[PDB]
Amino acid sequence: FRGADTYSVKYCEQGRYEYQRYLMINRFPSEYKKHFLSFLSNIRMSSGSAT
Amino acid sequence: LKAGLLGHYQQEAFEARKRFEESTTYPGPIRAATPGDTRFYSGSLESIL
Amino acid sequence: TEWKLSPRDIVLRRFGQHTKPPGKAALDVGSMRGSVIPFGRSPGEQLV
Amino acid sequence: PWWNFQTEHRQRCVLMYGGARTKNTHNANHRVFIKKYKRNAFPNRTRHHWAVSMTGVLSQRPRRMPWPYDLTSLIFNQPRQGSDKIGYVVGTSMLKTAVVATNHMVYYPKFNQRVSRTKRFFAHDEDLACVEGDLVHIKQCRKISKYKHYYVFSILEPNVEGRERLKLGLKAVPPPLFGYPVSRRIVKLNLTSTEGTQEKLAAAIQEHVQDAYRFSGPT
Amino acid sequence: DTEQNLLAREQHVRSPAYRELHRPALTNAAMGLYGGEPGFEKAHRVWVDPDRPHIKHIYNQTALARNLRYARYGYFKRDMHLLDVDKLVRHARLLPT
Amino acid sequence: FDTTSPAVLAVKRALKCRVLRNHLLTNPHNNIIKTVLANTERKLNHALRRLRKVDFKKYWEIIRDHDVQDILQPPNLVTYRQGSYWKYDWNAGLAISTNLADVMDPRGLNGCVETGRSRSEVARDLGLSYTRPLHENEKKQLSHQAVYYERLAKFKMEQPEAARAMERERFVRKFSGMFVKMDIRSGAPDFPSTYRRLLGTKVVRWASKRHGPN
Amino acid sequence: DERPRDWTVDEITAEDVKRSPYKEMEMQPLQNLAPRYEARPKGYFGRTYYSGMKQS
């Protein structure tokens, strides 16, 4: 069963990240505020012995 | 609702809108009022804290 | 001139107002008991 | 070879539980129905159970499934299913709550057809502008009341006749003359004089006595 | 002259025969069990007044409780000695000349 | 040479319905005129329902002039409850027929996609008022909110020895309750619907599991 | 002192502010919070990424 089965040449000649299509992932504006505040808090973490 | 009548409605959504911008005369740019706050955030209920 | 129409006699169907029902135009899902295939089960049938 | 989705689901089940599925689940078992009650004396008022009833929400026959391709998916780009909806206002008897009837599609693959079902939602309008007859666009939100998690985002089409009838001091929509009945018994309207109501009451109580006599059965 | 005709109607409404005749439908807990017993598996006969109804939407269009056909003239020909012709002219279907 | 305008076709159907009703009055045993009247009334309903959407001023003039205000009413409540009476406007191609600039102000009819504000909050931030003409009960609902607050505040100021006992027994009933711990069961919005398997054999407080549209 | 030192119209006041709002910097390092990474995978859990359950 499928002992000799080959795939296309396009799969092994493609570059990286060229298959990803542009998707417009919309969300709620409260989720926009929550994710923006979470990313702003994660960026502003002080550099201690854990970061 | 019936989705097959959507695109013809889109033509009406064109044919009214192009009718609007040629009918009325814009007097001038109205100044922008500041937006308030909505009480309809998504997700669960937040706290008063 | 005048319109003496009353909508109560229209809705409640006074004077025996009879609307003829359509002919087998029910189109419900519960009565159907057959699997629908494109071109039917036997598409080209010739009566010999 | 290109494996199907069932291979991926089996891989997920193997990585979760250690194994895919124990074998011999069919067993061809003869499920026999043993009746206990009398012939037309089942203890229910609407649905009388007399056969083996299948149990299952999405694994029953004839098979249904939600059909995500409708007007709402064509108009609105949604973050999740049921976030934005478009419907009609049918009831404004509650304060700050518009009853919005919306439609969705259910797919039957056996008959290969989609059908439109209707769901009623309670939406919120603060300034009391929604009139019965408005094509409105509602959106999901937080819990406002026990049955209010939607709100009127936009009025896509206002009912002009309803607003003009409200300006006249009338109702926005004239109320229907038909509706839900009160019993399966034929609700006869009693039109009698003020003196002929006692004999009509005697006839009604005699009819109720004969309906109770139906408990006796033969003779 | 109209106060007597109003007050007789208001005293006829508050009479015990009118309130017993226009009782609402009996509930399933008032009739008895969940069903199976003949005569007690449904409610009893409900009579409504067409001018002062104790239910909303007197008529309906259901499959089994359909009652618009029973509102026409002829079902009130059974009791013409007790009949009120004012409500007969106002509330009946297919009345003759 | 115009005879097919909707305002003309509607009054033609209404005059035809008047003629058929006047024939059925003097001769109620004519069975063909019954069916013709039942078809002409449905066609009159269709003509007036399209006239309401394509030219509202002439429709309102026809409604006002001939003493027929409720000629466009839903027949059945059960069909009206599911929005099938208003689905006629979408299915016939009449949903975008009314010009919004000539009737209302369309700035406060659309919510904000950027800020997520509602339809009412955008008009609130613009200083516009969109409120339907209320009835007496709808004004009684909004006017009697302050009256009970002034009554309860006057009772708290005027009878302290009774208000203190009422608040004390209310706090005793609140504090000593069994389900006072905030949990998933106490935090559910609909307890008979989420936990419906307890309503038969365990909980006798709720006799049914359905109270709303959910 | 019942009025806080940084009282604006939007009524957002810090309890441990201890400084005039004109003296404090606009952006500073946050030492009170803790950096947290994603610990719950949605659809991908293991050996072979076929689809990843991206619709979920």
Short mmCIF file of C-alpha atoms in Angstrom, two decimals, chain D residues 57-201:
data_model
loop_
_atom_site.label_atom_id
_atom_site.label_comp_id
_atom_site.label_asym_id
_atom_site.label_seq_id
_atom_site.Cartn_x
_atom_site.Cartn_y
_atom_site.Cartn_z
CA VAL D 57 -27.25 15.29 19.75
CA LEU D 58 -25.21 15.20 16.53
CA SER D 59 -24.95 11.42 15.92
CA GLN D 60 -28.59 10.69 15.03
CA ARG D 61 -30.49 10.02 11.81
CA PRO D 62 -31.31 11.94 9.62
CA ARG D 63 -28.05 13.79 10.15
CA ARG D 64 -27.94 17.55 10.69
CA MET D 65 -25.02 19.97 10.95
CA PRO D 66 -24.60 23.76 11.13
CA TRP D 67 -24.16 25.45 7.76
CA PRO D 68 -21.73 28.37 8.23
CA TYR D 69 -22.25 29.81 4.72
CA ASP D 70 -25.11 32.31 4.87
CA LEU D 71 -25.78 36.06 4.71
CA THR D 72 -24.02 36.78 8.01
CA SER D 73 -20.73 35.18 6.94
CA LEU D 74 -20.98 36.99 3.59
CA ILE D 75 -21.47 40.42 5.20
CA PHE D 76 -19.62 40.34 8.52
CA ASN D 77 -16.06 39.18 9.12
CA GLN D 78 -16.49 37.63 12.52
CA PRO D 79 -13.92 36.86 15.23
CA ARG D 80 -16.07 33.88 16.24
CA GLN D 81 -19.36 32.29 15.24
CA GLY D 82 -22.41 34.22 16.40
CA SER D 83 -20.56 37.41 17.33
CA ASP D 84 -22.29 39.70 14.82
CA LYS D 85 -25.88 39.05 13.72
CA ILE D 86 -28.51 40.82 11.62
CA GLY D 87 -32.19 40.45 12.35
CA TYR D 88 -35.57 42.10 12.76
CA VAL D 89 -37.12 43.72 15.83
CA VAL D 90 -40.30 41.90 16.84
CA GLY D 91 -40.87 42.95 20.46
CA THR D 92 -40.30 46.09 22.53
CA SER D 93 -42.54 45.41 25.54
CA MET D 94 -39.52 45.34 27.87
CA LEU D 95 -37.50 48.38 28.89
CA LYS D 96 -34.11 48.71 27.12
CA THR D 97 -34.55 45.28 25.53
CA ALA D 98 -35.35 44.70 21.86
CA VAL D 99 -36.38 41.19 20.83
CA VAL D 100 -34.48 40.41 17.62
CA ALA D 101 -35.37 37.46 15.40
CA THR D 102 -32.36 36.20 13.44
CA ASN D 103 -31.91 33.29 11.03
CA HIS D 104 -29.28 30.59 10.61
CA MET D 105 -28.80 27.64 8.25
CA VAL D 106 -28.83 23.93 9.10
CA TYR D 107 -27.49 21.48 6.51
CA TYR D 108 -28.95 18.05 5.69
CA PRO D 109 -26.35 16.07 3.69
CA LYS D 110 -28.70 13.14 3.00
CA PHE D 111 -31.19 15.33 1.14
CA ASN D 112 -28.36 17.82 0.33
CA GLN D 113 -30.22 20.94 1.35
CA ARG D 114 -29.97 23.83 3.79
CA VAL D 115 -32.91 25.10 5.84
CA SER D 116 -33.40 28.41 7.63
CA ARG D 117 -34.12 28.20 11.36
CA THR D 118 -34.98 31.18 13.55
CA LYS D 119 -33.51 32.19 16.91
CA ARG D 120 -34.80 35.02 19.11
CA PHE D 121 -32.33 37.14 21.08
CA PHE D 122 -32.68 39.89 23.67
CA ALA D 123 -30.65 42.98 22.74
CA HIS D 124 -30.02 46.22 24.62
CA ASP D 125 -30.87 49.76 23.52
CA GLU D 126 -30.28 52.52 26.06
CA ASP D 127 -32.04 55.48 24.43
CA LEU D 128 -35.15 53.43 23.43
CA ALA D 129 -34.89 53.91 19.67
CA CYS D 130 -35.59 50.38 18.41
CA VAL D 131 -39.13 50.05 17.06
CA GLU D 132 -40.77 46.75 16.07
CA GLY D 133 -39.98 46.43 12.37
CA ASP D 134 -36.36 47.65 12.37
CA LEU D 135 -33.72 45.69 10.50
CA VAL D 136 -30.97 45.86 13.11
CA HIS D 137 -27.38 44.66 13.43
CA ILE D 138 -26.65 43.26 16.89
CA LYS D 139 -23.33 42.25 18.42
CA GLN D 140 -22.19 40.02 21.27
CA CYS D 141 -21.20 41.60 24.57
CA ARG D 142 -21.02 40.88 28.30
CA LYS D 143 -23.88 39.54 30.38
CA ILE D 144 -26.32 42.42 30.87
CA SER D 145 -29.30 40.49 32.24
CA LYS D 146 -30.15 36.81 32.69
CA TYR D 147 -30.91 36.51 28.95
CA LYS D 148 -29.21 39.63 27.51
CA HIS D 149 -25.75 39.15 26.01
CA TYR D 150 -26.34 41.05 22.74
CA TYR D 151 -26.69 44.75 22.00
CA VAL D 152 -28.00 46.79 19.07
CA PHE D 153 -24.86 47.94 17.28
CA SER D 154 -26.65 49.66 14.40
CA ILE D 155 -30.16 50.19 13.03
CA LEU D 156 -29.70 49.20 9.39
CA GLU D 157 -33.31 50.04 8.50
CA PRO D 158 -35.81 51.91 10.70
CA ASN D 159 -39.53 51.22 10.56
CA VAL D 160 -40.90 54.57 9.41
CA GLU D 161 -44.54 53.43 9.66
CA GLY D 162 -44.03 52.25 13.24
CA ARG D 163 -42.55 55.59 14.27
CA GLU D 164 -45.36 57.49 12.54
CA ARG D 165 -47.91 55.28 14.30
CA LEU D 166 -46.17 55.98 17.61
CA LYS D 167 -46.39 59.70 16.83
CA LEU D 168 -50.16 59.24 16.36
CA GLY D 169 -50.53 57.73 19.84
CA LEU D 170 -51.26 54.27 18.43
CA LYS D 171 -49.24 51.10 18.80
CA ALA D 172 -46.26 50.71 16.49
CA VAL D 173 -47.59 47.42 15.11
CA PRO D 174 -51.32 46.57 15.34
CA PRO D 175 -51.60 43.39 17.40
CA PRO D 176 -52.40 40.05 15.74
CA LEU D 177 -55.79 38.42 16.13
CA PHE D 178 -54.38 34.87 16.03
CA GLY D 179 -51.80 33.38 18.36
CA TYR D 180 -51.33 30.54 20.80
CA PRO D 181 -54.40 28.68 22.11
CA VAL D 182 -55.04 27.85 25.75
CA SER D 183 -55.90 24.13 25.35
CA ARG D 184 -56.43 21.44 22.74
CA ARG D 185 -60.17 21.77 23.38
CA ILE D 186 -61.88 24.09 20.90
CA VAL D 187 -62.12 27.48 22.62
CA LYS D 188 -65.70 28.46 21.85
CA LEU D 189 -66.59 32.11 22.36
CA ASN D 190 -69.66 32.45 24.56
CA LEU D 191 -72.13 35.14 23.49
CA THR D 192 -75.18 35.11 25.76
CA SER D 193 -77.46 37.60 27.47
CA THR D 194 -77.18 38.54 31.14
CA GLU D 195 -80.10 36.24 32.03
CA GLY D 196 -79.09 33.26 29.89
CA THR D 197 -75.67 32.72 31.45
CA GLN D 198 -76.79 30.26 34.15
CA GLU D 199 -78.14 27.73 31.64
CA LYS D 200 -74.96 28.16 29.58
CA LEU D 201 -72.96 27.50 32.75
#
